[PDB]
């Protein structure tokens, strides 16, 4: 598939890619099958260029390529985070009605 398959793997961002992702969340927090793509290649890119490799053979990165999911995944995390500060308020004995847990 293009850039998406079945196929769950450990992978990790870089020093370039992340900065990108950054970059494209200050501006939208949910970004579509453009804003996302543009992470996809402009990532992938800069990986290669700062490893040395080439922007036209990410395909090798493998482990370490990105792809619409890659961006998906961090974009969800990063707004499950912020969020969460508030999600951990919403429960009992805090500043706003909510059921009891512990």
Partial sequence: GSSGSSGRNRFKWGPASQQILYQAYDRQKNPSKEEREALVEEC???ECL????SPSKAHGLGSNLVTEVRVYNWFANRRKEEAFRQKLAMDAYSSN?????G
């Fill in 50 to 53: 700062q490893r040395g490799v």
């Fill in 97 to 101: 009605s909510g059921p009891s847990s």
């Fill in 44 to 46: 992938n890119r800069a």
